[PDB]
Design a protein around this motif. Sequence first.
Motif, PDB file in Angstrom:
ATOM      1  N   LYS A 129      19.077  64.778  84.650  1.00 15.07           N
ATOM      2  CA  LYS A 129      18.666  64.352  83.324  1.00 15.07           C
ATOM      3  C   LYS A 129      19.711  63.497  82.641  1.00 15.07           C
ATOM      4  O   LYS A 129      20.892  63.733  82.824  1.00 15.07           O
ATOM      5  CB  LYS A 129      18.317  65.580  82.502  1.00 15.07           C
ATOM      6  CG  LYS A 129      17.182  66.339  83.146  1.00 15.07           C
ATOM      7  CD  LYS A 129      16.687  67.482  82.304  1.00 15.07           C
ATOM      8  CE  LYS A 129      15.414  68.061  82.890  1.00 15.07           C
ATOM      9  NZ  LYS A 129      15.055  69.271  82.118  1.00 15.07           N
ATOM     10  N   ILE A 130      19.273  62.459  81.923  1.00 13.69           N
ATOM     11  CA  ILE A 130      20.185  61.538  81.240  1.00 13.69           C
ATOM     12  C   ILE A 130      20.895  62.272  80.130  1.00 13.69           C
ATOM     13  O   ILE A 130      20.273  62.863  79.239  1.00 13.69           O
ATOM     14  CB  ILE A 130      19.476  60.270  80.697  1.00 13.69           C
ATOM     15  CG1 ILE A 130      18.851  59.488  81.855  1.00 13.69           C
ATOM     16  CG2 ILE A 130      20.498  59.350  80.009  1.00 13.69           C
ATOM     17  CD1 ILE A 130      18.104  58.235  81.420  1.00 13.69           C
ATOM     18  N   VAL A 131      22.213  62.164  80.151  1.00 15.70           N
ATOM     19  CA  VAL A 131      23.022  62.882  79.208  1.00 15.70           C
ATOM     20  C   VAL A 131      24.093  61.997  78.582  1.00 15.70           C
ATOM     21  O   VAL A 131      24.551  61.033  79.188  1.00 15.70           O
ATOM     22  CB  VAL A 131      23.641  64.092  79.945  1.00 15.70           C
ATOM     23  CG1 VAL A 131      24.835  63.669  80.764  1.00 15.70           C
ATOM     24  CG2 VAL A 131      23.941  65.211  78.990  1.00 15.70           C
ATOM     25  N   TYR A 132      24.441  62.286  77.337  1.00 17.18           N
ATOM     26  CA  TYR A 132      25.466  61.519  76.654  1.00 17.18           C
ATOM     27  C   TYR A 132      26.207  62.473  75.754  1.00 17.18           C
ATOM     28  O   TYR A 132      25.583  63.135  74.926  1.00 17.18           O
ATOM     29  CB  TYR A 132      24.859  60.400  75.816  1.00 17.18           C
ATOM     30  CG  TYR A 132      25.915  59.507  75.238  1.00 17.18           C
ATOM     31  CD1 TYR A 132      26.541  58.547  76.028  1.00 17.18           C
ATOM     32  CD2 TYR A 132      26.334  59.658  73.924  1.00 17.18           C
ATOM     33  CE1 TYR A 132      27.563  57.759  75.526  1.00 17.18           C
ATOM     34  CE2 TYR A 132      27.351  58.880  73.411  1.00 17.18           C
ATOM     35  CZ  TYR A 132      27.962  57.932  74.216  1.00 17.18           C
ATOM     36  OH  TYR A 132      28.964  57.142  73.698  1.00 17.18           O
ATOM     37  N   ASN A 133      27.528  62.546  75.921  1.00 16.44           N
ATOM     38  CA  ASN A 133      28.364  63.450  75.129  1.00 16.44           C
ATOM     39  C   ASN A 133      28.039  64.897  75.505  1.00 16.44           C
ATOM     40  O   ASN A 133      28.200  65.812  74.698  1.00 16.44           O
ATOM     41  CB  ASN A 133      28.106  63.255  73.632  1.00 16.44           C
ATOM     42  CG  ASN A 133      29.131  62.385  72.965  1.00 16.44           C
ATOM     43  OD1 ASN A 133      29.970  61.771  73.620  1.00 16.44           O
ATOM     44  ND2 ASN A 133      29.067  62.323  71.641  1.00 16.44           N
ATOM     45  N   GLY A 134      27.555  65.089  76.724  1.00 19.67           N
ATOM     46  CA  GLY A 134      27.216  66.418  77.179  1.00 19.67           C
ATOM     47  C   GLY A 134      25.867  66.931  76.731  1.00 19.67           C
ATOM     48  O   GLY A 134      25.544  68.086  76.996  1.00 19.67           O
ATOM     49  N   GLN A 135      25.067  66.095  76.072  1.00 20.44           N
ATOM     50  CA  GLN A 135      23.744  66.530  75.618  1.00 20.44           C
ATOM     51  C   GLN A 135      22.644  65.591  76.068  1.00 20.44           C
ATOM     52  O   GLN A 135      22.871  64.389  76.201  1.00 20.44           O
ATOM     53  CB  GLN A 135      23.723  66.694  74.107  1.00 20.44           C
ATOM     54  CG  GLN A 135      24.189  65.489  73.362  1.00 20.44           C
ATOM     55  CD  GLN A 135      24.421  65.790  71.909  1.00 20.44           C
ATOM     56  OE1 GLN A 135      24.709  66.935  71.547  1.00 20.44           O
ATOM     57  NE2 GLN A 135      24.288  64.776  71.057  1.00 20.44           N
ATOM     58  N   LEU A 136      21.473  66.157  76.348  1.00 19.27           N
ATOM     59  CA  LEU A 136      20.319  65.388  76.806  1.00 19.27           C
ATOM     60  C   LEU A 136      19.858  64.427  75.696  1.00 19.27           C
ATOM     61  O   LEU A 136      19.574  64.846  74.570  1.00 19.27           O
ATOM     62  CB  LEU A 136      19.175  66.329  77.215  1.00 19.27           C
ATOM     63  CG  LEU A 136      19.170  67.133  78.522  1.00 19.27           C
ATOM     64  CD1 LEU A 136      20.515  67.758  78.811  1.00 19.27           C
ATOM     65  CD2 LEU A 136      18.102  68.203  78.418  1.00 19.27           C
ATOM     66  N   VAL A 137      19.712  63.151  76.044  1.00 17.08           N
ATOM     67  CA  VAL A 137      19.339  62.121  75.083  1.00 17.08           C
ATOM     68  C   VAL A 137      18.124  61.322  75.517  1.00 17.08           C
ATOM     69  O   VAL A 137      17.784  61.286  76.696  1.00 17.08           O
ATOM     70  CB  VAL A 137      20.522  61.130  74.883  1.00 17.08           C
ATOM     71  CG1 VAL A 137      21.672  61.807  74.147  1.00 17.08           C
ATOM     72  CG2 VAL A 137      21.017  60.609  76.233  1.00 17.08           C
ATOM     73  N   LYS A 138      17.448  60.700  74.557  1.00 18.74           N
ATOM     74  CA  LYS A 138      16.301  59.861  74.866  1.00 18.74           C
ATOM     75  C   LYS A 138      16.826  58.438  74.786  1.00 18.74           C
ATOM     76  O   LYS A 138      17.443  58.077  73.791  1.00 18.74           O
ATOM     77  CB  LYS A 138      15.203  60.051  73.836  1.00 18.74           C
ATOM     78  CG  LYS A 138      14.066  59.066  73.986  1.00 18.74           C
ATOM     79  CD  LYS A 138      13.002  59.311  72.961  1.00 18.74           C
ATOM     80  CE  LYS A 138      11.894  58.303  73.137  1.00 18.74           C
ATOM     81  NZ  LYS A 138      10.840  58.438  72.088  1.00 18.74           N
ATOM     82  N   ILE A 139      16.618  57.647  75.839  1.00 20.74           N
ATOM     83  CA  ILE A 139      17.089  56.265  75.871  1.00 20.74           C
ATOM     84  C   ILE A 139      15.929  55.316  75.701  1.00 20.74           C
ATOM     85  O   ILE A 139      14.847  55.553  76.215  1.00 20.74           O
ATOM     86  CB  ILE A 139      17.804  55.939  77.187  1.00 20.74           C
ATOM     87  CG1 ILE A 139      18.857  57.002  77.473  1.00 20.74           C
ATOM     88  CG2 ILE A 139      18.479  54.554  77.104  1.00 20.74           C
ATOM     89  CD1 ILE A 139      19.948  57.074  76.431  1.00 20.74           C
ATOM     90  N   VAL A 140      16.166  54.241  74.960  1.00 23.54           N
ATOM     91  CA  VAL A 140      15.161  53.218  74.694  1.00 23.54           C
ATOM     92  C   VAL A 140      15.843  51.854  74.730  1.00 23.54           C
ATOM     93  O   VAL A 140      17.063  51.773  74.590  1.00 23.54           O
ATOM     94  CB  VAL A 140      14.499  53.423  73.298  1.00 23.54           C
ATOM     95  CG1 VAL A 140      13.610  54.655  73.298  1.00 23.54           C
ATOM     96  CG2 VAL A 140      15.558  53.589  72.242  1.00 23.54           C
ATOM     97  N   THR A 141      15.072  50.807  75.016  1.00 27.07           N
ATOM     98  CA  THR A 141      15.551  49.428  75.045  1.00 27.07           C
ATOM     99  C   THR A 141      14.536  48.646  74.251  1.00 27.07           C
ATOM    100  O   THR A 141      13.492  49.177  73.854  1.00 27.07           O
ATOM    101  CB  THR A 141      15.634  48.803  76.462  1.00 27.07           C
ATOM    102  OG1 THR A 141      14.394  48.987  77.161  1.00 27.07           O
ATOM    103  CG2 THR A 141      16.745  49.405  77.250  1.00 27.07           C
TER     104      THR A 141
END
Lengths: 104, 104, 104
Positions: free
Chosen positions: C67-79
């Motif tokens: 799962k995509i993670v950022y700063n150790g937490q699951l995040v929703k990515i968009v473009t």
Amino acid sequence: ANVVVSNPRPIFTESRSFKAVANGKIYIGQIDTDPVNPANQIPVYIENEDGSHVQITQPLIINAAGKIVYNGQLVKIVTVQGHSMAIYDANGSQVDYIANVLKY
Amino acid sequence: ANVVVSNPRPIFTESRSFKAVANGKIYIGQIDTDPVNPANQIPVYIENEDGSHVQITQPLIINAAGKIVYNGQLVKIVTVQGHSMAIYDANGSQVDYIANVLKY
Amino acid sequence: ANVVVSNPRPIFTESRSFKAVANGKIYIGQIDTDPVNPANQIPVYIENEDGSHVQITQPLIINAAGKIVYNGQLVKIVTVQGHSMAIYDANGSQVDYIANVLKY
């Protein structure tokens, strides 16, 4: 050829490891509310192949495969409006929470 | 930013255990019929990056990762209309059946 | 009842085995280009629960659960627009490449 073949059944896995949320529990409720609290839960219905809907009780049970099951068989669950979603593992530990499914 | 990044490749796993339907078979057919029967099957196409489509034969083969594959490579499969879908494991046991993908 | 309960967070697994692309990388770029090349990458943003978007650096990280993670937490990515997407395992080996997510 516009209809792409894929897997329509949702699978729920852990958020820190690659494992199904075996015997976990999913709570469906009011957008931006804790669905675990009975007063925040909304009606959930099984949509039969028939196209009919049979309302069931919460929480929804996630089997060993990470798929929602009712009466030992895989089911499709639907609600009338958007909802919040909290997923808990067999030990009552929270795996994930989506405040507004419709916005995600 | 309205384009959310995700995994477009479908993955097919077992219904009672968290495993891939390794070396399983997928049959696509008329809505509400048994796709296993050749008389109910409908055309299936590989949609190339090119946008072109090349018709392939059934059933679709699932590799060990639970993904459809053809010629040793991950492929995107499409059909003209809605379809019923039956998934079988390597041992000929039915894993799942969706009578109408469009309704699901 | 039209809202179907499902798992909204994308999970990234290997292509030749049923495993999570643990500690892998995802590059988002111009449609039909190699996103690994910075010259080809487009901006990516985290869409917070708040509705806000915070641009992050690439590649995107995939945790042990795939799962995509950022700063150790699951995040929703968009473009902003359609894009090509390349997924690589922890060893820099390519796992998958989708030239145009919009078409797939």
